[PDB]
Structure 1
Amino acid sequence: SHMSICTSEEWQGLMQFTLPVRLCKEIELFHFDIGPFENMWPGIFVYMVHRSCGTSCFELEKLCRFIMSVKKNYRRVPYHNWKHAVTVAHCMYAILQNNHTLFTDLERKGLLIACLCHDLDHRGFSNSYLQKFDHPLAALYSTSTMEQHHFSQTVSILQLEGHNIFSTLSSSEYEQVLEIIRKAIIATDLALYFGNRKQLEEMYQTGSLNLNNQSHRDRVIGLMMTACALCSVTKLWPVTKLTANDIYAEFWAEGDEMKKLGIQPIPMMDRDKKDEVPQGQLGFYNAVAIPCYTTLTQILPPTEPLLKACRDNLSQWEKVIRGEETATW
């Protein structure tokens, strides 16, 4: 295998980890911020899987090896890191806890794993960069470049000794869950969000949306994945602002690399144009975040708290633009 593998101490440590009792009820909520509980992150994921699919959904030892190896294969980049992975998985958990009867046991397992692995081995570089500089990854994966790589790395971890949490599924269900995971991870490519949201809006408005129609179902799951991947915009303001700093730290590092190679970066990736960030955020919320959560709320109403939170943060960015912001840290 070309993947890094967890050590015995790492996975055995997770197997023995116990979440504090009082914290459990907080994990059920949409706005929960895992930020202040780093040592507990892998344990929070185990808990979410168990509450969603039962204590025997996966053999515990294999699940712990899988989680700790996934952690080891996320890089030390500013944003697309291990913290992000667990944050996205938690949003999926909150959505599922409020819509669990609409999804099968197989889909719940697949989606939680897809979320934990959706940015596996991210290098801190965008698909735009990889394609622009003809990186080998872009030759191998023409579109949704990094996302196809993330799925390939996910399959690779399952192949590590004692890491295949899905081997006990029948051969048909095994193939089915890998497909759910592949489509879900690919769905996190924002380039695909615009078309997917437009199609879902048409399906919903014409009254043709049918959750039992597999093609419709795949699209709903795709929008759910987008919603989870974008969830930093659904946290309490200070948490959302702190995360934005990480997002931009990564964007700016990419812009720095571009300048070194003679290609000027777009303003968003230019460290010297940080004054444009508030307006950029307004643009992003208006073009992507708000419509995403608006459509998600239409199709799955219990997800409304995410939309409400996004609207609140849009209002905070507007305050920044008007020069009304309080103190930021």
Structure 2
Amino acid sequence: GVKTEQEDVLAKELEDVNKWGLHVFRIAELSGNRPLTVIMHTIFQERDLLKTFKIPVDTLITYLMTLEDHYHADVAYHNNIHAADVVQSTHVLLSTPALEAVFTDLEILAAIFASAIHDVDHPGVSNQFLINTNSELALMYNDSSVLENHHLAVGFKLLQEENCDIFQNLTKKQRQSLRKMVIDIVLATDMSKHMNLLADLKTMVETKKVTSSGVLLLDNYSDRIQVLQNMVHCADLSNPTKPLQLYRQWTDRIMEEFFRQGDRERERGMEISPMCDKHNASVEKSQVGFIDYIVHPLWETWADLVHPDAQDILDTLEDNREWYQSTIP
């Protein structure tokens, strides 16, 4: 009735779940490659989501293990560890003081569940790649947000496996509302929505109303969903805002995946893709561009929205950017 020592050591790492910079690779090791399961489980307990939504525990574990098993282990970046990290990041973002008591449990659950499924069954290559190779996924989704339509459909479909329906006691109203939120959040992880999402987040900060004390007011679906959409998208682009030991690992793993797409574009290649070659284009300049044009404009705008809650995160982002710069000849 008491834990094993590996389980204990894992429980002790998991005490860092509410903090930015969790040792997620270590959790993956300690969990036997189950970081998405142990983290989602921990989060659901801490947020009381099992009681609130009458989720049987064995059903949750069954679904989570099934979900984690359709993330590919032979993909270096877009795997269960990335899912876990994004779940845990979204989890922290939701506890930010500026958002205290703003969102409902169904919203919280949508944000978390979305984060969990958002890259499921990712094949390790890009939308453009899938489209140019005339792949079945691109044909099925009529070329638009191919991967993101796929992740949603797999995540939802897995609820139908044996003892996997975690939402079996939600009413139809809740299930319809949850389903819609989750669709809207995951579709927003397509990077081609980045510029519009960011515009709409800048507009919100311009017009930012406030409640009785420092907490945002969001009185319509369109704004609430916008915030949750930019929240999960922030989490998905959170690697450069982590301690550098973490960030470097993520960079290695993205580079492997992208070099591997390169190597799969020699025969086909439909001609090389953006800065993915050992021959040319530094890894370091690529991180500096990523941070300058994408990651920092987003996190900066997020930081005004939740001011001063994100200062530390933005500081780390800026330190990491100066570090990558300083490593360029």
Fold shared by both chains (TM-score > 0.5): yes
> 1:39-71: CA deviations, max 9, x gaps?
332222201121123442421111000110011
Residue range with higher mean Cα deviation, 94-103 or 67-76: 94-103
CA separation of 1:52 and 1:149: change in aligned 2, threshold 3 A: same
Q: TM-score under structure 2 normalisation? A: 0.87
Asked whether 1:48 is paired with 2:38, we answer: no
SS in 1 for 2:165: coil
Q: Do the aligned partners of residues 18 and 93 (structure 1) sit closer, same or farther apart at CA in structure 2, a change above 3 Å counting?
A: farther
CA distance in 1, matches of 2:218, 2:69: 36
Cα distance in 1 for partners of 2:161, 2:11 equals 33
| CA drift at 1:130 | 1.2
How do residues 141-290 of structure 1 correspond to structure 2 at under 5 angstroms? 141=141, 142-207=143-208, 211-273=218-280, 275-290=281-296
Asked if structure 1 preserves the Cα contact closer than 8 Å seen for 2:59 and 2:163, the reply is: yes
- Could you list the runs of 4 or more consecutive aligned residues of structure 1 that deviate by over 3 angstroms after TM superposition? 17-25, 206-210
SS at match of 1:269: coil
User: Is 1:101 the equivalent of 2:98?
Assistant: no
User: Is residue 2:25 matched to residue 1:35?
Assistant: yes
> Could you say what the CA RMSD is over the residues aligned between the two structures, in angstroms?
2.0
* CA distance in 2: counterparts of 1:147 and 1:24, whole angstroms: 29
Q: Tell me the percent identity.
A: 24
Aligned residues of 1:293 and 1:307 also touching (Cα < 8 A)? yes
- Partner of residue 123, structure 1: 123
Using the size of structure 1 for normalisation, the TM-score is 0.87
SS at match of 2:162: coil
Query: Are the structure 2 counterparts of residues 101 and 306 from structure 1 closer, same or farther at C-alpha, using a change threshold of 3 Å?
Result: same
Distance (Å, rounded) in 2 between the aligned partners of 1:20 and 1:281: 32
* Larger CA deviation: 307-316 vs 83-92: 307-316
1:293, CA displacement in angstroms? 0.7
User: Is 2:305 the partner of 1:303?
Assistant: no
How many residues get paired?
A: 306
How many angstroms apart in 1 are the aligned matches of 2:67 and 2:102? Answer: 28
Match of 1:8 in 2: none
Question: Per residue, is there more helix in 1 or in 2?
Answer: 1
* Partner residue in 2 for 1:113: 113
Q: 1:232 to 1:22 in 2, by over 3 A?
A: same
Point out the more displaced range, 129-138 or 57-66.
129-138
The CA deviation string for residues 211-254 of structure 1, in whole angstroms up to 9 with x for no partner, is 22211122111111111111211211121012100001001111
Distance 1:123 1:314 in 2: 29
Offset of 1:20 from its aligned partner?
Answer: 5.0
Q: Which runs of 5+ in 2 are unaligned?
A: 210-215
Answer whether contact 2:262 2:277 (CA < 8 A) is retained. Answer: yes
